[PDB]
Amino acid sequence: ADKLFINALKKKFEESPEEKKTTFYTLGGWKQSERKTEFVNAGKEVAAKRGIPQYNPDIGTPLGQRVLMPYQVSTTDTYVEGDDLHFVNNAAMQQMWDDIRRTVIVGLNHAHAVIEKRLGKEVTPETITHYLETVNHAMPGAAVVQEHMVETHPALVADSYVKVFTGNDEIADEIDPAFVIDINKQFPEDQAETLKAEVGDGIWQVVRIPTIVSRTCDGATTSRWSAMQIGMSMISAYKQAAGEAATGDFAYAAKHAEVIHMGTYLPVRRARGENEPGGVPFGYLADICQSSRVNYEDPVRVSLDVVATGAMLYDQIWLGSYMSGGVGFTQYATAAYTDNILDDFTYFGKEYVEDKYGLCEAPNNMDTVLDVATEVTFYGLEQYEEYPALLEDQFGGSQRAAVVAAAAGCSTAFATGNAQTGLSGWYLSMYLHKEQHSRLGFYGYDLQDQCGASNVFSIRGDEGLPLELRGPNYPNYAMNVGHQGEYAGISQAPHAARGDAFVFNPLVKIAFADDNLVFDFTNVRGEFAKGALREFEPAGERALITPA
């Protein structure tokens, strides 16, 4: 019956969502808001304590001449003021990033070959389990060889550990299950078969370093820290000299030859090492999100969970802090994961496709792009025109451009089963939207949008790439809000419609299928809500080593 966003609009405003007029200016300004009132009071306290003015509602212009709205976290019944979705104020969002940043995947295949071929020693499921006991003591920062070592406090580093996975069920069954990511438990049968076949007899470690270290340091720490403690545990468990020539082979394997970073390093203007947000390709972000293994009968839900994951990380933390800062970009991102708005538009498109072509059954060509992206764009824009409350909700043109094009591009990919025609549909949506309303986004929103159509199918050096391989360092995408997380969703979309177990890297997909993570990647939007309510318990806090 109702569009999916109607309940949220009725919560925000006294008027029915269709009504065109309202009342302004008599709401009390900031005084209408519980959260702004909290902030006013805290600012006075802070300024007095430190002897320097801080938050003051009388500086600049007076917030709250209109309704300061609640937001529904999409797929939840949780309604919060938008400040509770700012990454600074939301521990769930900070932990989501920490859990990615502090992860690396490191093979044991080369390592086991060094042991067998260079050292002449045996590797068995028993020696692997012994090694895994050893590395789970050492990885958080504790000693195995030298006398008079000082160590990290176990409780400060409780979130760091090492697990393994392999496609060989019989071998997996022989390793203590405390250390194993069980692919057959975590994934539905057809997905498990695909993932096991991709891994084969390879054995891979998923290493998580301590959040407290990641926060003190940076993402490029992760693979170094991992390798040091892998190295020590190989010495201890396999009876090497503690520092012989073979020890260097384990180092080079763990740091270079068999490591999978979450993010690659960035060029000098935006200089950063590995495991920073800009290095994480869109296909990896889709695979980090675990919606695919729990919501696989609903491709829209899978795709929009990916969009939530990426809009928060890429717009709020990455573009809104690493690349800028200040108040930042909360609502540029919340547009993609609140009020069930993107959900309504994308369900529309999925239904359109299902009825016309069947999922994955449309021709992979421009005719399909023109059909589906145009239809879905016109639907979404019509909703802003029919529901003035919707338009006042997603008040910035950029937000609207992102949401409408995300639906258009995901729907096109649902039709073709191919992310590249989904991307073409995203750009067509932009062009149509711009002409319809004689506006699109902010001053710089459509840099990538105007380069977009020509670069979708280019094959040139710094232009051509399948969408799955693109990321925040693809040149056209390196600067602007309201695109990156949506592109992760479009990358996910054809794979979700196809029922594929992963989008770009099966190892990354399996690595986040782990109940010992702090953040729950199977329910990203639920976790955002939990953090907004101040109900999420992050790792990395220093309470144990500070005064009461």
């Binding site: 009342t23 302004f24 016109f378 338009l391 997603q394 950029s398 002409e435």
Partner: protein, 247 residues
């Protein structure tokens, strides 16, 4: 020139704003002093500040392009580059953001135009800006209920209207008087209070807004129904796509 495809009133209005041979309808008279006051860059009677010497006093490089391109008067004088910025309601304001920038670069010399969803700006040499601003304020570029002059705190293009049919303004620069039916500008574009308000006329009635608007909407003329305009946009998408692949 043909400017823009399409067979709706919206399409024809977009063409008319861009066409310098189309005489913009003048709807209201504003004094020179009142334009200066709305702009807020200098006081009436204050000399224009300069950013560099008059061109006649500098030794310009020997350059055929300089010789062929006549500077605007404010460039000859060395005036500051200053701005005027407008916000247009999605509820049928006559002009809209990309319409303005497209039209400005057809009509006006020496212009830096910028388009955003909630604001649209022109920057040019101060004396020339004053002359352009008069036309932007006096003509059908501007309705005093559905358009606003705003150099900051621009929110309102996408908001519901108030009970008088006025767009939201966080700073309330334009005030409708229920007793008179007229709108006055009570602050300059950056929000400082004026000595004496500026009359901006009556808001256009609904029928006239619909005749003049350049936005497509379901409750006016929908873009999807202007099939020739849609066709051209789709053509451009396809040709760009093919061109990037092979030429």
């Amino acid at each position: 020139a043909q400017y823009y495809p399409g067979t709706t009133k919206v399409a024809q209005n977009r063409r008319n704003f861009c066409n310098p041979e189309y005489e913009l309808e003048k709807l209201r008279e504003i004094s020179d002093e009142d334009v200066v006051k709305i702009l807020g860059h200098r006081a009436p009677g204050e000399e224009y500040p300069s950013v560099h010497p008059p061109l006649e006093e500098m030794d310009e490089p020997e350059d055929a392009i300089r010789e062929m391109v006549e500077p605007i008067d404010g460039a000859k004088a060395g005036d500051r580059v200053r701005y005027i910025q407008f916000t247009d309601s999605m509820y049928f304001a006559p002009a809209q953001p990309y319409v303005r920038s497209r039209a400005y670069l057809c009509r006006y010399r020496g212009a830096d135009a910028g388009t955003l969803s909630g604001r649209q700006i022109i920057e040019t040499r101060e004396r020339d800006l004053e002359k352009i601003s008069k036309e932007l304020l006096e003509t059908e570029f501007f309705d005093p209920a559905r358009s606003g002059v705003r150099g900051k705190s621009v929110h309102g293009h996408s908001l519901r209207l108030d009970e008088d049919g006025m767009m939201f303004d966080m700073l309330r620069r334009q005030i409708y008087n229920k007793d008179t039916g007229r709108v006055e500008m009570v602050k300059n574009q950056i929000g400082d209070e004026l000595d004496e308000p500026v009359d901006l006329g009556e808001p256009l009635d609904e029928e006239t807004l619909m005749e003049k608007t350049t936005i497509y909407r379901v409750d006016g003329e929908a873009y999807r129904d202007d099939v020739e305009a849609v066709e051209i946009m789709q053509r451009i998408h396809v040709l760009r796509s093919q061109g990037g692949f092979n030429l």
